[PDB]
Nucleic acid binder design. Sequence first.
RNA 1: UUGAUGUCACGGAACAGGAACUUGAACAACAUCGUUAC
RNA 2: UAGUAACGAUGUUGUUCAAGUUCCUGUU
Length: 1536
Amino acid sequence: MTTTMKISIEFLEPFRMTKWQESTRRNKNNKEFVRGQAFARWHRNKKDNTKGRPYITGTLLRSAVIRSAENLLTLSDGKISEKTCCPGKFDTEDKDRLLQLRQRSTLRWTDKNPCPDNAETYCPFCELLGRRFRIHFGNLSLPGKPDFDGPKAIGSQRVLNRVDFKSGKAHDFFKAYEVDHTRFPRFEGEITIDNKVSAEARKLLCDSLKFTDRLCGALCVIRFDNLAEKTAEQIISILDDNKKTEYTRLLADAIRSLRRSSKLVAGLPKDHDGKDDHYLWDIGKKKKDENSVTIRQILTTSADTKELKNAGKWREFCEKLGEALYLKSKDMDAEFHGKPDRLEKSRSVSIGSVLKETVVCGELVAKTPFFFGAIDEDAKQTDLQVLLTPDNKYRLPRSAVRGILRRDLQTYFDSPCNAELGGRPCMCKTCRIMRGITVMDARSEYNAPPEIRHRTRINPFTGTVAEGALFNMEVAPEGIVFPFQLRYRGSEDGLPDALKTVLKWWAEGQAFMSGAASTGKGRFRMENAKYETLDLSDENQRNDYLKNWGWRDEKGLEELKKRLNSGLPEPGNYRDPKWHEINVSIEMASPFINGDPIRAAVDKRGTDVVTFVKYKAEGEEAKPVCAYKAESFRGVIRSAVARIHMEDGVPLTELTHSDCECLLCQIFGSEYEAGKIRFEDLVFESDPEPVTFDHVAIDRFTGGAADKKKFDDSPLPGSPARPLMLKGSFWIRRDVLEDEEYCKALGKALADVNNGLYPLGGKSAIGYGQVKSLGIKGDDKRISRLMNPAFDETDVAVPEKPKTDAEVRIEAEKVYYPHYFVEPHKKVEREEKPCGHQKFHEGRLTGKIRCKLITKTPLIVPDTSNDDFFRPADKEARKEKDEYHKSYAFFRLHKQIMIPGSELRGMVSSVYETVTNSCFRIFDETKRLSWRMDADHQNVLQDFLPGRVTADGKHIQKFSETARVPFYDKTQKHFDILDEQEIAGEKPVRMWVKRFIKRLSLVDPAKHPQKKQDNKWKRRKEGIATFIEQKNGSYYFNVVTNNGCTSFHLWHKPDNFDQEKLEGIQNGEKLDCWVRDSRYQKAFQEIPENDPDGWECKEGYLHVVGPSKVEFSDKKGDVINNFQGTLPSVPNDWKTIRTNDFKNRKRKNEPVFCCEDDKGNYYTMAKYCETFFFDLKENEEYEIPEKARIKYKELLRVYNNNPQAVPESVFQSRVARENVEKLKSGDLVYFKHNEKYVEDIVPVRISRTVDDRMIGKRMSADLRPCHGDWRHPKGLCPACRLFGTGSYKGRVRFGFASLENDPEWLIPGKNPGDPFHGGPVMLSLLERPRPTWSIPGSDNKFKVPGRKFYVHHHAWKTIKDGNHPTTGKAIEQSPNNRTVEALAGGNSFSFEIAFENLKEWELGLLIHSLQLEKGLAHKLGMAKSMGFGSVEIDVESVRLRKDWKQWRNGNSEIPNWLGKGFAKLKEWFRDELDFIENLKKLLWFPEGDQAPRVCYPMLRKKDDPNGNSGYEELKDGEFKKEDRQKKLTTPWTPWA
RNA sequence: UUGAUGUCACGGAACAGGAACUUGAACAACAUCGUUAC
RNA sequence: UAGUAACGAUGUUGUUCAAGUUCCUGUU
């Protein structure tokens, strides 16, 4: 007796979902079951397990149908078809149930009796209301009834908000689930109607089902009828198998960046030679073990797997791989909800019968990168994320649009709302308009990943970043189009005036929707607006509206968009939007950098930092453009304001801004109110291609490149020819331009920015940034009227340089050395506190110094961007893999000769820090030294005893003595009778050892005429002689010693005098003879066939090392000559090398072995013997500490990395040939010990000795790098206060020097008429320095000398011709020297030095270090160990700064500064200023007719035509061991 | 998997504050091998 | 029982980033 009607709803927007709770907190007393009643619910079967499906109750649809029926019944004056309708009853006497009452002011029509219950025929509204069921409403569920695994598998919980209006920051908040509508767009159910309900109630029900449009926070229309985890584990295991475990976070941040495209893995950078050993992209490979994959190979084979071919799959793989790597690198409260008021009776009111409808279509594009915070969980790498769609599309929610309409409607009026989330609806002017507004979501169809930005926070006391202030941020691209649709229904004749004014504001590009609006985030603009007003008051238009469900669906919208008239309606009352745009145009004069290291790690150029580049969208694809961040510009202007204004004593950079109305707190805002000025990004107006500059860090002692300290950067190029314009804008509020107190502050700050201070960008300490001018427009001269400069234009001249007094006595026919260290003092002061990079102090100076550099000796500053600049034309370009002859040019920026700022910074820093006797800025406190020990028995080789380590690596057992066993000879055979188990020393052998051999001579007492002078004939006694056999040269004898106790057989070689005693031998005569003993320490295997004497059989260990001591050469040495032809070839394996020739041929002395390889090398090999350790003394061992093992490790590392070694791997020793690492267990060593503790372990007889301490502990404790903690503390060296350090910014900025006259090169070029290119000159070898010649020994006597200042001379006239400086031979090219292009003497440059917050004695010392006396000169450039690079600097106008208006050129104050600097220098050191005298002696320039000839020695004396006693004779006599330091300190000592 | 005579949740902007920055001459002379003889 | 004496040859590149901070303050 029923009739089922099947309905089905279909969503057009993401609906919302509530949270599940058990059936105990489901009363009217819970505050989360209420406020969760207007959403969809989540049912789970088998309670306590999150598994179920969503559903919508029937009571909610009943309430929506009731509300639509009330809204529809007053539109036809209460008559459905024929009969009038009763007003209905909404009163209930019981209120313990009915968990929620109605607070709505029910509509009215035809007020009459409420049709009491004791009736028999009701009003159709009472049949719809339900007065066994009359109209039963059923549950709506999913079509197929599936089962998901929880509420997080269909949706995502996001946080909503509730912001304030005056202090526009926040209030409480809440959160809810939202499910996307592209995955779950359909729900189904039915409605059970009785038979005898009516024939007019069904029409009302159908019209009410068609008139309802939203159910759960969304529009609707109701109708009726495993790789990434294992790859992460593999990469982590690779990083842990090696020692590169500190590159894990950079690897994570660089791998997450590859999610943009898969064509970036085949374009990762390489090394500088084009190899495949990058420092992070090639971790894992070794010298051996080819089956070792790297990270580049892992990313390459994972780029083509037929699973990661799509973009979404590759993006997801990159994201979760980066997340896993970040998580692996890691481990090394206020919310309101509800409270609705339970009102007893609703105040029923009438609204009338006039109802219209307005549709506004169009679209709104983005003009700046927008931001919508959707920071979710389970993703902790970015910590500031954006809102995305489940298919990675950008969207703007309707909550943000609704809140922004609310804010603009409150701003159009001048009265905020005062609602408190409860009770009767609010009835102000801005809540009667907001109750008829309906908007929609967007999708933007872009589908591209967002870029990541890095931000920091700077401590304004030191200048560096604060502790713990570093975070990321991701922003959406610029230029995305969102579809827009607004709909309003009310009683007016169209739109109101407030909405028309707000839409006219939005049509001018002033719709600041959401984001970090203070730093120039999303600003949209509504375009292509259409509108059309319907009329639901009549009946011929309402039925056509109800026939097609309005026009909400896609077909209805495509039919509606053909009826809308174009152009928005003009408002009746305009309001002049409250934001004003001001343009900004900056022009620079130097390079510019805005760091980005991750892009440098992914980029294929192979640099360390690259400039910042943002993307922009063109509809489906993104293109990059270089720009300047908005946060950096905002920070610059904020710091420029904060350092001038006082506000009651303490400046604005020291306040806490807790509850203060400071001047920064009222313009730039704080954590309690929003700001009133919004900046924006700055584009560069052109296409500047980045260039590459190389840098290095020159050590102080042994001035050369320090270890691990070579780097580069890729900034944008700018020069006084092409000035790198910058364009942008920023927005200010309307009620700030009208104030006269804030505009003055902004004008003062921009006037300080314009006058040269506050450089923009990165490394401004070497001449980057340097704003030349700044000009704003668009403000009617309210701010740009205080930005006018004002100088003095005086005529005071600059005082001339004083005359020098330190002179040297240089004579002819003598040579000099070029090093001459400068020994320092012993008192470096660190008892002063640094100033602080805050407000400009009162008694300190700030300004500019303009200098003038003029060269007087050829200068070389190379342009290391390319080699082969002097390459011949019209030939082959270059072979792939070879070592050619490098040749460079001079430095150019835009085809203009320049000198960088870091060169001058380093030079002046060295001179300034050696004047004030300050801390060694950069130093190498590692790398302990080592020396080869000499070959003399008494001094060194006496203490090294033979030994052997025990079964465990803890003790060394010593031996008694040694004897040498002959190998590689022709008089025995020891290789084919001993196996490999006994020649490696792991098994004892048994040899026969002889100690003393016996010579023979016939006449002892009557031998004084000929012999008996050698004094060795003092142990002869007597002896009888026999004869048993005849030989060719020798004769047999059987001699007794004193009484016939023993007899020995020997072979005696007679001589002239012996010949006569020989003459007759009948085998039986008794000759007279004498026996003498001589030393013979040999040990053979069996027995030799020449001495059948008593050999003492002993027991010991044997060990071999291989054929060492090769005198290889290239010029047919004295032993290869006078040979017997046909030299053999090199054998491919040892144990077969024999003796070829003898060194002495009269006697049978030392044997050699001459061979010849495929090249022109000629080897001559000594060492025809090996050593045998016998007589192992037990029960006496010595322990090995850790210092011995560290010394042994350094010894092995030196042995294995040697470029001067023998090219053949057969003639090396065992230590270097087999490449071993640690001390094994059971190997022979030569150790040194004293009282149970060993000191040194060497492998061979004559090896090298490593010193115990490092080189950092051979100085004083005060001269070490003045770095560390010992606001900032007071422990800083006097040179780390002018120039910076880590955790303290320096207050001196240098600048790019530029040439102004004509070049005037050294040698003319190849093309006449083009005076802008020079000719090439070829240099000498230029080999790296040796610190093992200044520190000769290692005990305690040799400390570290000074700072290695090179002397001035003229030795470039010999290189100009083509000879060598030491000899006179012509130099020949090779793949080890360069061919540079140089300038000549008589060129002029000009640069500028900016300083701030200096004292009056630091400026005097800086001027004394810039300009020297009138007889000295500086030295910069390349190859200044010859005569190359000699400059002098003259100082021009020194214009100071005293206020933000006037600058007061102070040329007339220099001598007071110089006197104060000298007075401070006298105060520190009383009368011990000898280091300044030495430094003035070392900077002396030969004024005239003096030609000091300096050069380095040669190796020996026989290889230079002058014969000047090279290094191998200078180690004895002059520079022996104790005069080295002394003779290298005196500024001009004769080279001898 | 809801209750019926009463749901303005299209009744609520994840908003407000923060300088990828600090320090650094692209430079530079004496070492490397071990034993041989009595 | 036991150790004493210092000699012979002339050739060759190296570093290519390092030390720091890598997240906080708050809504009623």
